[PDB]
């Protein structure tokens, strides 16, 4: 009945190759998400510049005069969009974490002691291109990204100022 | 004849210490391969810069003006080479997975909605330094690396655009 | 005299619960050792940075300006030290493999076609903070770790370049 | 920033203060090093003292 001991070793192996893997489709997502974060970053400039020139954020890419929603893109990026200076990009719809598939988070800068502070966080939009305060246009959170599937920092709401 | 039961336990041990180890020379390879992936990454910059400055990729390291094939190297890297902006490095010829011994995969960026998208995948080369489209110069697949012995992502062909 | 057959089964059990366990205090060691390997890894950065900034490795943690010998530590780590850019940590002195108890191995990077190549291997030290070549300061091999009690790779001597 | 062959050279480093607004030489007003930042927790370069000139 070392066989048991064997079948034990079998048994413990039996229930050892199942459900012993947390959150990795969760984890890949973050980077897979974060890949999307990497792109619209540059848009912030003319967005600022537009705000810099004018004092008002650009209502969008085109207000800024820059690459629109369906513009600048690639892997994990099926849109890149500005909203009254609030910039946003979307996850791809495949080869992703099945979860984060096609998700976004906005990028909104509200004026500081310094110039302004952006925010890597939830899909939101600025009340006006003129304003700095932005609105949590949540898109029923689909594009919104799990703060879990987000890293610790990039967990911002429109409220972020 | 617990002896049988014994010799059984022997027998099951008999055919238990043979062929019960899949794919690990396969697995080490991936990292051993992936080690090689880690290096030519930096070359992408001047490659881009060359493409950035010019609008044309650098025909190679030297076109870019950067570390040639037999340049930047070390463990698991017995070459690091650019091909019309398409960059490639080779596995070592020892202390490796006997399989992946001396193998490569190219690195080719083709222009995006964004700037451009590289590709970790098979040894290939760009049609022209001017171009973005690259050619699956396969080297009879020796340097080409097993998509199995590659991780899931780094499975790209010249076609990757 | 099935009793013999019994006492046989007894007898074969008699000399079956003794000396039939190789090298496991040897094996735990490796990981128990390798635990120590896990830590000083981060030190390599400023070490590099010091070498990166200066062109010379940091004579130590303090030359680099980083966590000294008795600094960064924990389980299986009763020291973590840099030596002219050559970094080293020691095994604990208890709850270990009684063998590997309080043992080390250095970490020395010598300049490449690429930048440089480190080495997980024996306690050694770099001739100069300026240099790359390192000296097999062996400490009478106590801190030096059994290549057996080391895994296959992490078997490097100062000579490793 | 303390005046150079060129104009002047700044220094990313420890909380310090210049002896005078007129001067260039600065004083290592250290604030008991709390605000002062660990050269470890600093990168390699930004490791400057008032002495930095």
The two beta strands, B116-117 and B134-135, are unpaired
* Strands C104-107 and C86-90, sheet pairing: antiparallel
Nearest to A71 among B5, B12, B113 (CB): B113
Chain C residues contacting B, CB < 8 Å? 5, 8-9, 12, 112-115, 117
For residue C126, list its beta bridge partners.
Answer: C134
Nearest CA in chain D to C62: D40
Helices B2-14 & A2-14, crossing angle to 10 degrees? 40
Q: Which residues of C touch D39 (CB under 8 A)?
A: 65
Enumerate residues 6+ apart whose C-beta is below 8 A from C88.
C40, C79, C80, C81, C82, C104, C105, C106, C107, C123, C124, C125, C143
**Structure token digits, residue D14:** 């420890």
Q: Are B75 and B94 in contact (CB under 8 A)?
A: no
Task: Sort strands A110-111 and A116-117 into parallel, antiparallel or unpaired.
Answer: antiparallel
Cβ <8 Å between A2 and B12: no
User: Which residues of chain C have a CB within 8 Å of the CB of D42?
Assistant: 65
Determination technique used: cryo-EM
Contacts of D43 in chain C (CB under 8 A): 46, 49
C67, D40 contact by CB (below 8 A): yes
The rounded distance, in Å, linking the Cα atoms of B48 and B111 is: 11
Q: At what angle do helices B2-14 and C2-14 cross, to 10 degrees?
A: 40
Residues constituting chain D? 53
Contact C131, C107 (CB under 8 A): no
Residue A59 near residue A129, CB atoms below 8 Å: yes
| DSSP annotation of D13 | B
Chain B residues in contact with C112 by the CB 8 A cut-off are 72-74
| CB contact at 8 A, A81 and A102 | no
CB contacts, 8 Å: D45 with chain C? 53
Query: Which residues, including other chains, have CB under 8 Å from residue B123's CB and lie 6 or more apart?
Result: B88, B104, B105, B106, B137, B138, B139, B143, B144
What does DSSP assign to residue B42?
G
Distance from the Cα of A113 to chain B's closest Cα (Å) equals: 33
Q: How far apart are CA A14 and CA A117, in angstroms?
A: 53
> Quick check: C113 and B74 CB within 8 A?
yes
* Residue contacts between B and C (CB atoms, under 8 Å): 25
Tokens of B144: 């080409």
Resolution in A: 6.0
Chains that touch D (3 or more CB pairs under 8 A): C
The four Cα atoms D34, D38, D42, D48 give a dihedral, to 10 degrees, of 80
* D45: nearest CB among C53, C64, C67: C53
Of B103, B115, B76, nearest to B85 by C-alpha is B115
Q: Do C46 and D44 touch (CB under 8 A)?
A: yes
């Amino acid at each position: 009945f070392t066989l048991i001991e064997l079948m034990i070793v079998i048994a413990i192996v039996g229930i050892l190759a199942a459900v012993a893997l947390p959150a990795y489709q969760d984890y890949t997502a973050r980077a897979q998400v974060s890949e999307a974060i990497l792109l619209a970053e540059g848009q912030k400039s003319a967005v600022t510049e537009y705000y810099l020139n004018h004092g008002e954020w650009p209502g969008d890419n085109s207000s800024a005069g820059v690459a629109t929603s369906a513009d600048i893109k690639g892997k994990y990026v099926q849109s890149v969009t500005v909203a009254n200076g609030v910039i946003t990009a979307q996850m791809a719809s495949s080869n992703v974490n099945n979860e984060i598939k096609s998700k976004k988070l906005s990028l909104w800068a509200k004026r500081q002691n310094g110039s302004v502070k952006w925010f890597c966080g939830q899909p939101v939009t600025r009340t006006t291109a003129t304003a700095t305060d932005v609105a949590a246009a949540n898109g029923k959170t689909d594009d919104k990204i799990n703060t879990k599937h987000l890293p610790s920092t990039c967990r911002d709401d429109s409220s972020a100022s």
